[PDB]
Structure 1
Amino acid sequence: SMSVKKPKRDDSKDLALCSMILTEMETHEDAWPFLLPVNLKLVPGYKKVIKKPMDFSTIREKLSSGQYPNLETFALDVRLVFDNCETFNEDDSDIGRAGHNMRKYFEKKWTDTFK
């Protein structure tokens, strides 16, 4: 409340640390379905069904240009990538599997880096 603050968590390395995590996601061999925006002209259904498209290259641009106010908003966009993937792809497809693998990979790095 007013003039009553919890002790100040050092957040000065968050930008760099999210960038490293994103680099490791970019270079994973199962990143391929997630590197670029889904082509909304060429993939029937995508535009209407997926209310908020997200991908690594878009996250990378937002990060680099100061569009994440804090590390939670960054984690929300990463998770959105995988939530979208699950909405549109069967679990038993190459892309469905890729999404489950990448989410697991991301969550571990997140905990190890910040929790």
Structure 2
Amino acid sequence: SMSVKKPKRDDSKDLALCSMILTEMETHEDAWPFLLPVNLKLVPGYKKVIKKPMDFSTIREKLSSGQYPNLETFALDVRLVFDNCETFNEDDSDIGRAGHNMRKYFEKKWTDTFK
């Protein structure tokens, strides 16, 4: 509260470490469904159904331009990519499986780096 602060958790490396994680996700073999924004003209249903589209290229641009105020807003956009994928894709599809694999991969890197 006013003039009463918990000790300062060092956040000075968070930008670098989020960028490293994002690189690792970009280079995973199963990242191909997530690299670029879904083409809203060519994928029926996507525009109406997926209220907040998100992809790794869009995260990378946001990261590079100071649009994440802290590491939790970064994790929220990564999870959004996989939550969108689950909303639109059957679990037993290549893209559905890709999304489960990537979410697992991300959550381990997240825990190992920051928890």
TM, length-normalised to structure 1: 1.00
1:36 CA drift (Å): 0.1
Partner in structure 1 of residue 29 of structure 2: 29
Q: Return structure 1 stretches of 4+ with deviation > 2 angstroms.
A: none
Deviations 1:31-51 (A, max 9, x none): 000000000000000000000
SS at match of 1:102: helix
Whole-Å separation in 1 of the counterparts to 2:85 and 2:54? 10
Structure 2 residue runs of 5 or longer lacking an equivalent are: none
1:7 CA drift (Å): 0.1
1:15 CA drift (Å): 0.1
1:74 CA drift (Å): 0.1
User: How high is the sequence identity, in percent, across the aligned residues?
Assistant: 100
Partner in structure 2 of residue 11 of structure 1: 11
1:80 CA drift (Å): 0.1
TM, length-normalised to structure 2: 1.00
Deviations 1:63-91 (A, max 9, x none): 00000000000000000000000000000
Whole-Å separation in 2 of the counterparts to 1:112 and 1:11? 16
Whole-Å separation in 1 of the counterparts to 2:92 and 2:44? 20
Whole-Å separation in 2 of the counterparts to 1:16 and 1:64? 10
1:9 CA drift (Å): 0.3
1:14 CA drift (Å): 0.0
Q: Aligned residues, how many?
A: 115
Structure 1 residue runs of 5 or longer lacking an equivalent are: none
1:89-104 equivalences under 5 Å are 89-104=89-104
Whole-Å separation in 2 of the counterparts to 1:69 and 1:9? 15
Whole-Å separation in 2 of the counterparts to 1:59 and 1:91? 24
The yes-or-no answer on 1:82 pairing with 2:82 is yes
